[PDB]
Each structure stands twice: as C-alpha cells, then as structure tokens.
C-alpha cells in the first residue's frame, strides 16, 4: 500500500 511518507518525485530507476 502507498507509503504516506514516500516522495512521488523520486527517480524510479
């Protein structure tokens, strides 16, 4: 499930 502390802007590489 989505981690609320995670940053969506991260490079997913």
């Amino acid at each position: 499930n989505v981690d609320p502390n995670a940053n969506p802007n991260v490079d997913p590489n």
Epitope: N1, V2, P4, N5, A6, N7, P8, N9, D11, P12
Partner: antibody, heavy 119, light 110 residues
C-alpha cells in the same frame, strides 16, 4: 520560506497559446513534484496533472490530455504550463502546487493566474 | 466528482459544523490519503488536514477530521467569521493521480 509565484493575468482569443510560469524559491526545485490545478468560473478546483522534476515525466488527468504541456527550467527553478489552441472553456484561474509526499499533497500553492479566453 | 461534498453548509458563530466527503469509486482504495483545503476567494488554497485527521502546525486547532466507511468528514468548532470560505476534500486515486471533491461553500451567519 517556500514560495511559489506565478506570472500575471492573461487575456487571449480562442486559438491563441499561453504559457504560465511558476517560479519557486526556498527549497530544492528538483526534490518535489509540481502539480497544476484549475478553477473555472462557478466551479471547484480540478486537478490537471503533475510533472516529475527529476525525470521530466508528465502525468495528465483526463480532460487535460491534448493541448496542455507541463515543463520546467531547472536553471531558474521554474515550472511552466503551456496551453495550445485555447478554448473559451479554458477560462479559469490556474494554480501550481507542490506535493511534499503522498500523505501531504499540495502543501504550498502559487497565488493563481487568471487566463481569460474570449472572442 | 469522484468525491461528493454538500454544495453548502451554514452555521452561527460559536457553533460546530461538519462537511462530508464521500468517495463514489473504489479508485480511492483504502481511502486513507484524504486531505482538506480551505479556499478564500482570490487567494491560494491552504492545506488544513492530511491523511484523514492530521492537522499540521500552523493550521487552527479548531479544524479536525475523521472518517467512517467511505465518508471523510471535516469538523470546524468555535465557528468564526473568517472561517467563511470554500472547503475541498482531496484523495489519492492510484497511479500517481489525485482528485478534488466538488467543494462546499461554508457560510457563517454573522
């Protein structure tokens, strides 16, 4: 202090193009995503999409796929919204807004840019 | 909208009022990434609640939020004239997308 400062009001004819700027300060521009939100007259806020400031990958909500472009210029920590082939129903106040995390979206907002499209 | 809010609510100074936000789609999943924004006209919206109930420091402690089932609620206590504004709920809806509720006009009957 985190600031998002947008360019001034625009008055356009249908078919014209417009480019709204969203200049940031007080944080590292490429650390956080820049989102865009619209409010048409007599309507509510509508999420338009966002651009990833590390990868450049844009995401557009349905309704904003076709004539809209999210971009940025890291040299001046600025995000842009460009609209091609403007329609009367593009008339709205456009906002930029940062997302900090999935839990905390839209923590800082630009002040809004009014774009009026009229014949 | 994917999130249904009452068009308007009204209250007198001192009272408490509650604004509902109901998901009309399972795209919200567990519906735990719900945020609320206060919007005075001609100004930028302001974050007042996130993750259903978390009020950040710098938002008034008269703002609170809860949920039951698929309905999230914002409650404003000790209603004051400056609370008059539009209020929007907001949810994550998967695949790095968000959606706002239709908005609620709050009138403080002063």
């Amino acid at each position: 202090q985190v600031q998002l400062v947008q360019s001034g009001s625009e008055l356009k004819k249908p078919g014209a193009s417009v480019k709204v700027s969203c200049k940031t300060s007080g944080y590292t521009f490429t650390t956080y995503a820049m989102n865009w939100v619209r409010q048409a007259p007599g309507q509510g806020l509508e999420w338009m999409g966002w651009i990833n400031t590390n990868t450049g990958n844009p995401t557009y909500a349905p309704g904003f796929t076709g004539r809209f472009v999210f971009s940025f210029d890291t040299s001046v920590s600025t995000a842009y919204l460009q609209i091609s082939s403007l329609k009367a129903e593009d008339t709205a106040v456009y906002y930029c807004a940062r997302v900090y995390s999935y839990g905390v979206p839209f923590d800082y907002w630009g002040q809004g840019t009014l774009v009026t499209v009229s014949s | 909208s994917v999130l249904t809010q009452p068009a308007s609510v009204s209250g007198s100074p001192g009272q408490s009022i509650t604004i509902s936000c109901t998901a009309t789609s399972s795209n919200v999943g567990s519906f735990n990434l719900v945020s609320w924004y206060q919007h005075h006209p001609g100004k930028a919206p302001k974050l007042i609640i996130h993750e259903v109930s978390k009020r950040p420091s710098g938002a008034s402690n008269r703002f609170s939020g809860s949920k039951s089932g698929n309905t999230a609620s914002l409650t404003i206590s000790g209603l004051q004239a400056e609370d008059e504004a539009d209020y929007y709920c907001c949810s994550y809806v998967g695949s790095d997308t968000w959606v706002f509720g239709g908005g609620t006009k709050l009138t403080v009957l002063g």
